[PDB]
Each structure stands twice: as structure tokens, then as C-alpha cells.
Amino acid sequence: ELSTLEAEMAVERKAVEDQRDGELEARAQKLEADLAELEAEGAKADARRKVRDGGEREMRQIRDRAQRELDRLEDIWSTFTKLAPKQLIVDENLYRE
């Protein structure tokens, strides 16, 4: 069943990646839109820079969440492919998954 399971795995990875790109694109459009609003309503100096830093930080958060999940999946697949008797699984989540 190695081929089928590897395929389903790859599909799940792609699902996570597509979700990541969608969320990030959304946050980028929201960032540029909000900046356009701050420039539209009067203006400010450091406030636009600060809110830009906030948007960039949030995008970093989204990318890093999806990256942690991708590493989780990679770890599941590595653990199952090399799975052999006498091996110890110290993570409850990894064993349940």
C-alpha cells in the first residue's frame, strides 16, 4: 500500500500549502487595503510603518503555522515509513495520528 498512502499524503500536504497561500494572500490584500485607508483618512507617519510591521508579523505567523503543520505531516510520514518493532513514540499526538 506504500504507493497509495504516499499519494494520499502528498495530497494532504498540497491541501495545507494551498490553504497557506490563500490565507497569506488574504492578509496581504487586507494589509494593502488598510494602508490605503490610512492614507485615505488624513495620513500619519510612523502609524503606517507600525501597522505594516503588524501585517508582516501576522503573515509570518500564518506561514509559520502552516510550516509547523507541514513538518508535523513530514514527521508522521517519516515515522511510519521507517516504523519498526521496538521503536518508542514519546509524543501522544504522533501516536494517535
From Swiss-Prot:
Induction: 6-fold repressed by starvation. It comes from Mycobacterium tuberculosis (strain ATCC 25618 / H37Rv). DNA-dependent RNA polymerase catalyzes the transcription of DNA into RNA using the four ribonucleoside triphosphates as substrates. Belongs to the RNA polymerase beta' chain family. The RNAP catalytic core consists of 2 alpha, 1 beta, 1 beta' and 1 omega subunit. When a sigma factor is associated with the core the holoenzyme is formed, which can initiate transcription. This is DNA-directed RNA polymerase subunit beta'. The chain holds residues 147 to 243 of 1316 of the full protein.
